[PDB]
């Protein structure tokens, strides 16, 4: 007879299509709320600096919790402690990059690798452009380019990370599931820096490129990305 | 049905409409526009009546066949491409043809033809160049314009009119169109002093003369 089978599979296809449309409205309004959150986070530090200055006092800002680390020195001739920490930072090739949250263990891990990396505090434009341009995902331990939101939602949906905006939000505002979102992100494969490094072997304080550039990593991401 | 309207979004940049989805809901007024709910011919034969089957089965099969391509989207054919001009080419400017048998010669530009090519006459009384097509890229456009806003080219000349047929013979309508457009162009360039000699001369690069240093 089939006149009920066709109408049932039409209703089922329409049901999952309306489900997908509701999910798209969900991630739209989540991205709007994220934009409002970033406005508040950017103006709040300025407003508190202003009230401290007009009160005469100072305002030590929040010491940053999110760094981006880039391996600038190659495979050859590495101390074994250093190559072990570079493996735990997942910086294997030269000019790889990873996000890293900061605490007492991780700061000393970055210190024990310091001549081989350039690591800094990335801003929201840096996190955006690294995710959209070079950001891939370790799906089934393969390397699938994040071309759709379903590739993120199938792996990280149980952490309420269902779109790339949620991914960017947790990376920038380091959340509870930063470990899982970060470990989902593959190590970034950046190109060699256009314009070029000033000096690879010496520290940034002494006019080189290694070590803790603080927020001058947002000049170097723009030209390695 | 109804009469089709034009786009209620004014286009802001390409791919972005100036009005959001709620504002365009309001402008379309969709609050009040809801809705809810071949192969055989029979021919007489003087027998009986035969059922002729159009689109018959194929007679032959090639011993192996290629498969069907995947479907891509943005790859239009040439006839419906969008056509761009440079800003330094406006109807009335003088051109320096750089490639063909009419190379080097200075030429009045008429209009943009429908197939990307430029319509051309540096008038045949001056430098022996007819109503000819040319390519935009293969032409230096100098900064010398004439005000041809009130000339009437015949509308019956297109790419289909200048397209090659198959020795070559000049037809009569070529000569008639040539004189009909030269009678409008040539008194308008005799108004500008020393311009007919400029169109009779040719372009050349001599010693010490470099195009990147020279403006034109």
């Amino acid at each position: 007879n089939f006149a009920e089978l066709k109408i049932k599979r039409l209703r089922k296809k329409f049901a999952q299509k309306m489900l997908r449309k509701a999910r798209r409205k969900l991630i739209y309004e989540k991205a709007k709320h994220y934009h409002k959150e970033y406005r508040q986070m950017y103006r709040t530090e300025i407003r508190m600096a202003r009230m401290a200055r007009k009160a005469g006092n100072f305002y030590v800002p929040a010491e940053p919790k999110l760094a981006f680390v880039i391996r600038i020195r190659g495979i050859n001739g590495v101390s074994p402690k250093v190559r072990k920490v570079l493996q735990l930072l997942r910086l294997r090739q030269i000019f790889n990059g990873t996000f890293v949250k900061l605490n007492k263990a991780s700061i000393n891990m970055l210190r024990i690798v310091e001549p081989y990396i350039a690591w800094g505090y990335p801003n929201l434009k840096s996190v955006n452009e690294l995710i959209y341009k070079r950001g891939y995902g370790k799906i089934n331990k393969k390397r699938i380019a994040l071309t759709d939101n379903t590739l993120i939602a199938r792996s990280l949906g149980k952490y309420n990370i269902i779109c790339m905006e949620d991914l960017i939000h947790e990376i920038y505002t380091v959340g509870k599931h930063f470990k899982e979102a970060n470990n989902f992100l593959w190590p970034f494969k950046l190109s060699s820096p256009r314009g070029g490094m000033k000096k690879k072997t010496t520290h940034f304080v002494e006019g080189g490129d290694a070590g803790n550039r603080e927020d001058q990593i947002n000049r170097l991401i723009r030209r390695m990305n | 049905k109804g009469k089709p309207h034009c786009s209620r979004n004014p286009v802001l940049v390409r791919g972005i409409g100036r009005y959001s989805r709620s504002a365009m809901y309001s402008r379309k007024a969709l609050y009040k526009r809801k809705y809810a709910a071949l192969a055989t011919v029979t021919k007489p034969v003087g027998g009986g009546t035969r059922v002729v089957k159009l689109r018959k089965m194929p007679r032959y099969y090639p011993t192996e066949d290629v498969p069907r391509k995947l479907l891509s989207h943005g790859k239009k054919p040439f006839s419906q491409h969008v056509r761009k001009l440079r800003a330094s080419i406006t109807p009335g400017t003088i051109l320096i043809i750089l490639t063909g048998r009419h190379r080097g010669k200075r030429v009045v530009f008429l209009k943009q033809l429908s197939s990307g090519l430029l319509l051309v006459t540096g008038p045949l009384s001056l430098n022996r160049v007819p109503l000819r097509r040319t390519h935009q890229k293969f032409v230096i456009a100098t900064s010398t314009k004439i005000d041809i806003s009130g000339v009437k080219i015949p509308k019956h000349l297109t790419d289909a009119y200048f397209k090659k047929k198959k020795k070559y013979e000049i037809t009569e309508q070529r000569k008639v169109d040539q004189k009909a457009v030269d009678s409008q162009i040539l008194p308008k360039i005799k108004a500008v002093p020393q311009l007919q000699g400029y169109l009779r001369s040719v372009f050349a690069l001599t010693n010490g003369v470099y195009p990147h240093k020279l403006v034109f």
């Binding site: 329409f14 049901a15 309306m18 489900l19 509701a22 999910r23 409205k25 969900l26 | 809801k34 809810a36």
Partner: peptide, 19 residues
Amino acid sequence: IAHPKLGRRARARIARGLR
């Protein structure tokens, strides 16, 4: 609304509300 099991009747109701 946008997750399947608990938002099923809500998606059904907005589907009827489209008509």
